[PDB]
């Protein structure tokens, strides 16, 4: 899967848990950005 | 400009470090230099990953 | 190194490359010749030095072997000499240059096992362990040494043999084109000290631009470029324009004499004779080697010509290691570091049970 | 694929007849409002549900429907749905069209 | 484990019997994902809006 839809996925988790627009800064964080690099810091969880 | 592409870069960097930050991943500003420096053109980051993990699991000696 | 210590050994054309597995680099470097009586025999340093009134014997001229004696001497002053070591008690990795003929290989091994007697060793191409050096198992890589070039491509690692492009252009040609150019202009480029002499400037002061007419211009309407160099000898000759025509010949061969294809062109025929599904991947991936890359800003001239060569859908991302010029011998540390990596070396059991052919089965 | 996120890629990529990365910008619509509710806070009981689509069903001019969609209803309580049986079939309804546009 | 299979494809088929008498529009597949969903507690009334607004984003 590319490297925008592996961070969606994980931003959603989040908001279940209770953490809200820290998952939403997380969006446009990235959303800022725009390389490969959040792909291994996607693999990198913890 | 290449005082001003260097403030860019680091601001780059720092976009970087507050998402390992977030995501809660464990990862140093120095660490995340020298990981960016390699897979910028160097190795896939799958691969990284599992060798990060690996030497963090050396150290635990 | 809780096993014993190994050794890693690469026969250049001109040097060879001896050391320990996982040091920074080869923990020695010697030069590729035997001297003997024209003291009766010595290697290295002592021959060079006293190649006034002896004679020298050169053991790996052009990646080929010239004699198998002095290959063994070569072997044997660089175990005994170069690191003062035991052979029978230490196992080595050795390299090989693009499509050996087999029947080396035989006369290799059954010295390894026979002269040395040691318990394990591995031979295998060059340029695929340099590329295991740079972390791409998947690339091409371009080495060219002092006597041999080739550019070969590697895809999921085991070369494609029917792409490896061979170039019988190194440093030899280089330095003499430029020993000729200089003595053509009116320098004193043309004696052995003067062959030094120019090796030398090529190696320091020669310069590598992206293209020969914008470089050729600027040096021709002012001399920038030209840089002034007073030995300890005293000796001063400053060339702006030389230099800048000393790298170019890689791309215009036709200034040194040359009928072949041009290193970008040729690693062009080599993505041409590639396959498609590895094309690209070939095409992104792609490393530089050979001692000849410590040229500065050269690596940058390759990837431009190398992004308007191929089509548009891939790209150039071209790996210009620092550590060229040791890149064969990086490439060694790294594949007998690794503790599965110990299965794939060959024992003295089964290559004195099986004979020593049998190094073309186990060292694939 | 059991976990939830993973199947709204597969749900949003069929119901918009695209590819499988292409469609992302559209697809964190999604992510954010289904995030936004997850735990409900009307209480469970199906009859309520059997009871509006039988009306629903009874004003359209089809009214034989309003028992053969009773029929339906206790064919599935008699094989196992894990007491999800409000959530769907609420959710068919919310979906709704009379064939005619009247 | 096949009786299993035979109860899915039952109940599924019953499912896509109510979802034509109702004329929702969902295909075998869909609804597939929907009930999929929708097994784990998912608030029906956010689905609902999402798939409505996803119909009529794809009408371009």
Same mark, same amino acid.
């Given at each position: 899967?590319?490297?925008?839809?592996?961070?969606?996925?994980?931003s959603?988790?989040?908001?279940?848990?209770?953490?809200?627009?820290?998952?939403?800064?997380?969006?446009?964080?990235?959303?800022?950005?725009?390389?490969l690099?959040?792909?291994?810091?996607?693999?990198?969880?913890? | 400009?290449?005082?001003?592409?260097?403030?860019?870069?680091?601001?780059?960097?720092?976009?970087?470090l507050?998402?390992?930050? @977030?995501?809660?991943?464990?990862?140093?500003?120095?660490?995340?230099? @020298?990981?960016?420096?390699?897979?910028?053109?160097?190795?896939?980051?799958?691969?990284?990953?599992?060798?990060?993990?690996?030497?963090?699991?050396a150290?635990?000696? | 190194?809780?096993?014993?210590?190994?050794?890693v050994?690469?026969?250049?054309?001109?040097?060879?490359?001896?050391?320990?597995?996982?040091?920074?680099?080869?923990?020695?470097?010697?030069?590729?010749?035997?001297?003997?009586?024209?003291?009766?025999?010595?290697?290295?340093?002592?021959?060079?030095?006293?190649?006034?009134?002896?004679t020298?014997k050169?053991?790996?001229?052009?990646?080929?072997?010239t004699?198998?004696?002095? /290959?063994?001497?070569?072997?044997?002053?660089?175990?005994?000499?170069?690191?003062?070591?035991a052979?029978?008690?230490?196992?080595?990795?050795?390299?090989?240059?693009?499509?050996? $003929?087999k029947?080396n290989?035989?006369? /290799?091994?059954?010295?390894?096992?026979?002269?040395?007697?040691?318990?394990?060793?591995?031979?295998?191409?060059?340029?695929?362990?340099?590329l295991?050096?740079?972390?791409?198992?998947?690339?091409?890589?371009?080495?060219?040494?002092?006597?041999?070039?080739?550019?070969?491509?590697?895809?999921?690692?085991?070369?494609?043999?029917?792409?490896?492009?061979?170039?019988?252009?190194?440093?030899?040609?280089?330095?003499?084109?430029?020993?000729?150019?200089?003595?053509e202009?009116?320098?004193?480029?043309?004696?052995?000290?003067?062959?030094?002499?120019?090796?030398?400037?090529?190696?320091?002061?020669?310069?590598?631009?992206?293209?020969?007419?914008?470089?050729?211009?600027?040096?021709?309407?002012?001399?920038?470029?030209?840089?002034?160099?007073?030995?300890?000898?005293?000796q001063?000759?400053?060339?702006?324009?030389?230099?800048?025509?000393?790298?170019?010949?890689?791309?215009?061969?036709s200034?040194?004499?040359?009928?072949?294809?041009?290193?970008?062109?040729?690693?062009?025929?080599?993505?041409?004779?590639?396959?498609?599904?590895?094309?690209?991947?070939?095409?992104?991936?792609?490393?530089?080697?050979?001692?000849?890359?410590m040229? $500065?800003?050269?690596?940058?001239? /390759?990837?431009?010509?190398?992004?308007?060569?191929? $089509?548009?859908?891939?790209?150039?991302?071209?790996?210009? $290691?620092?550590?060229?010029?040791?890149?064969?011998?990086?490439?060694?540390?790294?594949?007998?570091?690794?503790?599965?990596?110990?299965? /794939?070396?060959?024992s003295?059991?089964?290559?004195?049970?099986?004979?020593?052919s049998?190094?073309?089965?186990?060292?694939? | 694929?059991?976990?939830?996120?993973?199947?709204?890629?597969?749900?949003?990529?069929?119901?918009?007849?695209?590819?499988?990365?292409?469609v992302?910008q559209?697809?964190?619509?999604?992510?954010?409002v289904?995030?936004?509710?997850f +735990?409900?806070?009307?209480?469970?009981?199906?009859?309520?549900? +059997?009871?509006?689509?039988?009306?629903?069903?009874?004003?359209?001019?089809?009214? +034989?429907?309003? +028992?053969?969609?009773?029929?339906?209803?206790?064919?599935?309580?008699?094989?196992?749905?894990?007491?999800?049986?409000?959530?769907?079939?609420?959710?068919?309804?919310?979906?709704?069209?009379?064939?005619?546009?009247?």
């Open positions: 899967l590319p490297a925008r839809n592996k961070i969606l996925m994980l959603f988790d989040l908001r279940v848990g209770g953490l809200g627009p820290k998952a939403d800064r997380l969006e446009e964080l990235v959303e800022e950005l725009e390389l690099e959040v792909g291994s810091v996607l693999d990198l969880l913890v | 400009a290449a005082a001003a592409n260097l403030n860019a870069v680091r601001e780059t960097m720092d976009v970087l507050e998402i390992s930050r @977030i995501l809660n991943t464990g990862l140093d500003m120095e660490t995340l230099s @020298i990981c960016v420096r390699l897979c910028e053109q160097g190795i896939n980051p799958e691969a990284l990953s599992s060798v990060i993990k690996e030497l963090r699991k150290t635990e000696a | 190194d809780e096993e014993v210590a190994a050794l050994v690469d026969n250049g054309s001109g040097m060879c490359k001896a050391g320990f597995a996982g040091d920074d680099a080869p923990r020695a470097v010697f030069p590729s010749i035997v001297g003997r009586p024209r003291k009766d025999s010595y290697v290295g340093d002592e021959a060079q030095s006293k190649r006034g009134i002896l020298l050169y053991p790996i001229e052009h990646g080929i072997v004699n198998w004696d002095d /290959m063994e001497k070569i072997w044997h002053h660089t175990f005994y000499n170069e690191l003062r070591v052979p029978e008690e230490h196992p080595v990795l050795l390299t090989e240059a693009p499509l050996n $003929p029947a290989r035989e006369k /290799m091994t059954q010295i390894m096992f026979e002269t040395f007697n040691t318990p394990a060793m591995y031979v295998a191409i060059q340029a695929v362990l340099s295991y050096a740079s972390g791409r198992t998947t690339g091409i890589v371009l080495d060219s040494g002092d006597g041999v070039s080739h550019t070969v491509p590697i895809y999921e690692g085991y070369a494609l043999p029917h792409a490896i492009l061979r170039l019988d252009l190194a440093g030899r040609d280089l330095t003499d084109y430029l020993m000729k150019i200089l003595t202009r009116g320098y004193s480029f043309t004696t052995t000290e003067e062959r030094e002499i120019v090796r030398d400037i090529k190696e320091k002061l020669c310069y590598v631009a992206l293209d020969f007419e914008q470089e050729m211009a600027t040096a021709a309407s002012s001399s920038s470029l030209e840089k002034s160099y007073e030995l300890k000898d005293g001063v000759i400053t060339i702006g324009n030389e230099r800048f025509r000393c790298p170019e010949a890689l791309f215009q061969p200034f040194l004499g040359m009928e072949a294809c041009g290193i970008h062109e040729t690693t062009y025929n080599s993505i041409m004779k590639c396959d498609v599904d590895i094309r690209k991947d070939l095409y992104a991936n792609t490393v530089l080697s050979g001692g000849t890359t040229y $500065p800003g050269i690596a940058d001239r /390759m990837q431009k010509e190398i992004t308007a060569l191929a $089509p548009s859908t891939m790209k150039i991302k071209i790996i210009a $290691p620092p550590e060229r010029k040791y890149s064969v011998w990086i490439g060694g540390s790294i594949l007998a570091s690794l503790s599965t990596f110990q299965q /794939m070396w060959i003295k059991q089964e290559y004195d049970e099986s004979g020593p049998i190094v073309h089965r186990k060292c694939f | 694929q059991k976990s939830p996120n993973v199947l709204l890629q597969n749900l949003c990529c069929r119901i918009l007849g695209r590819s499988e990365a292409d992302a559209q697809f964190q619509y999604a992510v954010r289904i995030g936004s509710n +735990a409900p806070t009307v209480e469970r009981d199906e009859f309520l549900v +059997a009871e509006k689509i039988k009306k629903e069903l009874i004003r359209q001019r089809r009214e +034989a429907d309003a +028992a053969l969609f009773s029929e339906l209803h206790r064919k599935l309580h008699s094989q196992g749905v894990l007491k999800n049986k409000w959530s769907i079939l609420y959710l068919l309804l919310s979906l709704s069209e009379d064939p005619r546009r009247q």
